[PDB]
Design a protein around this motif. Structure first.
Motif, mmCIF file in Angstrom:
data_model
loop_
_atom_site.group_PDB
_atom_site.id
_atom_site.type_symbol
_atom_site.label_atom_id
_atom_site.label_comp_id
_atom_site.label_asym_id
_atom_site.label_seq_id
_atom_site.Cartn_x
_atom_site.Cartn_y
_atom_site.Cartn_z
ATOM 1 N N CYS A 185 28.356 19.384 41.432
ATOM 2 C CA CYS A 185 28.615 19.870 42.795
ATOM 3 C C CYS A 185 29.246 21.262 42.650
ATOM 4 O O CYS A 185 30.452 21.377 42.477
ATOM 5 C CB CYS A 185 29.567 18.945 43.610
ATOM 6 N N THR A 186 28.423 22.317 42.666
ATOM 7 C CA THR A 186 28.956 23.685 42.576
ATOM 8 C C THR A 186 28.423 24.616 43.690
ATOM 9 O O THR A 186 28.349 25.832 43.509
ATOM 10 C CB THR A 186 28.729 24.275 41.166
ATOM 11 N N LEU A 187 28.097 24.037 44.850
ATOM 12 C CA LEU A 187 27.629 24.809 46.002
ATOM 13 C C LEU A 187 28.785 25.142 46.921
ATOM 14 O O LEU A 187 28.674 26.016 47.802
ATOM 15 C CB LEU A 187 26.539 24.047 46.762
ATOM 16 N N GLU A 188 29.889 24.430 46.730
ATOM 17 C CA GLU A 188 31.143 24.747 47.397
ATOM 18 C C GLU A 188 32.279 24.099 46.623
ATOM 19 O O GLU A 188 32.042 23.186 45.829
ATOM 20 C CB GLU A 188 31.149 24.279 48.873
ATOM 21 N N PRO A 189 33.520 24.545 46.858
ATOM 22 C CA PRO A 189 34.668 23.952 46.172
ATOM 23 C C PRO A 189 35.111 22.602 46.764
ATOM 24 O O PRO A 189 34.754 22.286 47.917
ATOM 25 C CB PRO A 189 35.785 24.986 46.417
ATOM 26 N N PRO A 190 35.874 21.805 45.987
ATOM 27 C CA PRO A 190 36.111 21.983 44.543
ATOM 28 C C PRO A 190 34.895 21.583 43.707
ATOM 29 O O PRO A 190 34.217 20.607 44.038
ATOM 30 C CB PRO A 190 37.309 21.058 44.260
ATOM 31 N N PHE A 191 34.629 22.319 42.626
ATOM 32 C CA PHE A 191 33.458 22.047 41.803
ATOM 33 C C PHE A 191 33.618 20.750 41.041
ATOM 34 O O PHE A 191 34.700 20.437 40.545
ATOM 35 C CB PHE A 191 33.218 23.209 40.833
ATOM 36 N N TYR A 192 32.527 19.999 40.939
ATOM 37 C CA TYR A 192 32.505 18.734 40.192
ATOM 38 C C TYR A 192 31.451 18.764 39.118
ATOM 39 O O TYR A 192 30.406 19.424 39.252
ATOM 40 C CB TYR A 192 32.132 17.579 41.107
ATOM 41 N N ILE A 193 31.733 18.019 38.056
ATOM 42 C CA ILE A 193 30.717 17.638 37.105
ATOM 43 C C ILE A 193 30.689 16.133 37.012
ATOM 44 O O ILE A 193 31.741 15.531 36.792
ATOM 45 C CB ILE A 193 30.998 18.225 35.706
ATOM 46 N N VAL A 194 29.489 15.525 37.097
ATOM 47 C CA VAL A 194 29.358 14.093 37.209
ATOM 48 C C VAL A 194 28.541 13.535 36.036
ATOM 49 O O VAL A 194 27.398 13.930 35.844
ATOM 50 C CB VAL A 194 28.713 13.695 38.555
ATOM 51 N N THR A 195 29.128 12.602 35.301
ATOM 52 C CA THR A 195 28.433 11.966 34.179
ATOM 53 C C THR A 195 28.427 10.462 34.348
ATOM 54 O O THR A 195 29.119 9.890 35.180
ATOM 55 C CB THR A 195 29.125 12.264 32.801
ATOM 56 N N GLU A 196 27.648 9.792 33.507
ATOM 57 C CA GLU A 196 27.722 8.354 33.415
ATOM 58 C C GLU A 196 29.160 7.927 33.015
ATOM 59 O O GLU A 196 29.922 8.720 32.412
ATOM 60 C CB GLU A 196 26.739 7.819 32.353
ATOM 61 N N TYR A 197 29.492 6.689 33.352
ATOM 62 C CA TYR A 197 30.793 6.101 33.010
ATOM 63 C C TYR A 197 30.570 5.074 31.907
ATOM 64 O O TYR A 197 29.660 4.234 32.016
ATOM 65 C CB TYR A 197 31.357 5.391 34.251
ATOM 66 N N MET A 198 31.400 5.132 30.873
ATOM 67 C CA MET A 198 31.280 4.217 29.744
ATOM 68 C C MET A 198 32.314 3.102 29.971
ATOM 69 O O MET A 198 33.528 3.327 29.963
ATOM 70 C CB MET A 198 31.442 4.983 28.428
ATOM 71 N N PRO A 199 31.834 1.878 30.228
ATOM 72 C CA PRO A 199 32.792 0.884 30.712
ATOM 73 C C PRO A 199 33.798 0.371 29.670
ATOM 74 O O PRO A 199 34.873 -0.074 30.047
ATOM 75 C CB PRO A 199 31.898 -0.275 31.227
ATOM 76 N N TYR A 200 33.480 0.437 28.390
ATOM 77 C CA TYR A 200 34.404 -0.130 27.408
ATOM 78 C C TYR A 200 35.481 0.821 26.876
ATOM 79 O O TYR A 200 36.262 0.434 25.990
ATOM 80 C CB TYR A 200 33.630 -0.816 26.296
ATOM 81 N N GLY A 201 35.571 2.032 27.426
ATOM 82 C CA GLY A 201 36.725 2.916 27.114
ATOM 83 C C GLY A 201 36.492 3.653 25.795
ATOM 84 O O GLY A 201 35.358 3.737 25.328
#
Ligand code: DKI
Length: 268
Positions: A73-89
């Motif tokens: 999400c970098t079309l407006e602030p605040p900018f985000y980067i989104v990745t998969e979540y690894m459930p086991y830490g």
């Protein structure tokens, strides 16, 4: 570009890993009922260009042992980067908590191999990681391991990255030339990889126990290195020692490290 996603698609929950990764959050991409990780640009960074450079690299990485970018999400602030979540830490906690009859020496080798495959791919792409450590590796189903890939940098092989003055490093994972001169390279990642390999061999013990951070450079400069852990195969220790050679050029490539691990499986 194709990576842009709608920020209102995401339900933002708590800080990830109790805050140990900074402004990274657990979220849910509601539409898809999918838990994701979300790195945001908060007070930490007056460095918007830097965050965008980080995201740029992530858009060029696809490997089974590197964390998968889903969107930005970098079309407006605040900018985000989104990745998969690894459930086991992370791998550090996983090794410390695991049943060692399930996570056997065979599984440790698999873990190490997957990490060295990831780093071989980064090496080939002329990207540097700069924070390789068990805490920055993540565990999935069936002992799948993925290396975290926020904070990467472009850097052609034969080139060196110089971190700004007063930049703070994880001392006990940091190559001597990086300690002494703020100089990073793929070979300083290789050094960090040997330390990670020792963390794996010991089921997540703390490196250089009892050694003050002020003493680590002097210890290394005088030729001392962490001893071979009990039951660590001689061939794995030799590899560790190769990663901790004083001259970066004498350290193996990740191509070579990955190969060494593949061969160890056949030699077993
Ligand atoms: N993609 C991803 N999933 C997870 N899962 C995770 C991590 C820690 C924990 S815990 N047990 O709460 O500390 C639980 C889940 N971590 N995570 C990665 S990229 N974390 C991470 C990292 F390992 C290094 C730098 C930045 C990071 F956000």
């Amino acid at each position: 570009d194709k990576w842009e996603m709608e920020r209102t698609d995401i339900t933002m929950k708590h800080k990830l890993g109790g805050g140990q990764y900074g402004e990274v959050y657990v979220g849910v991409w509601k539409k898809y009922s999918l838990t994701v990780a979300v790195k945001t640009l908060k007070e930490d960074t007056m460095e918007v260009e830097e965050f965008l450079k980080e995201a740029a690299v992530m858009k060029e990485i696809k490997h089974p042992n590197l964390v998968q970018l889903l969107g930005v999400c970098t079309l407006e602030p605040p900018f985000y980067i989104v990745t998969e979540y690894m459930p086991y830490g992370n791998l550090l906690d996983y090794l410390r908590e695991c049943n060692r009859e399930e996570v056997t020496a065979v599984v440790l080798l698999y873990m190490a191999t997957q990490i060295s495959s990831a780093m071989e791919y980064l090496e080939k792409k002329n990207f540097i990681h700069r924070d390789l450590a068990a805490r920055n590796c993540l565990v999935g189903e069936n002992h799948v391991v993925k290396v975290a890939d926020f904070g990467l940098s472009r850097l052609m092989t034969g080139d060196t990255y110089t971190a700004h003055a007063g930049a703070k490093f994880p001392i006990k994972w940091t190559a001597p030339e990086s300690l002494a001169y703020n100089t990073f390279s793929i070979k300083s990642d290789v050094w960090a990889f040997g330390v990670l390999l020792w963390e794996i061999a010991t089921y997540g013990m703390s490196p250089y126990p009892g050694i003050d951070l002020s003493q680590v450079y002097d210890l290394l400069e005088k030729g001392y290195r962490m001893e071979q852990p009990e039951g660590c195969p001689p061939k794995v220790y030799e590899l560790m020692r190769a990663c901790w050679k004083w001259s970066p050029a004498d350290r193996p490539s990740f191509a070579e490290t990955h190969q060494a691990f593949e061969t160890m499986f056949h030699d077993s």
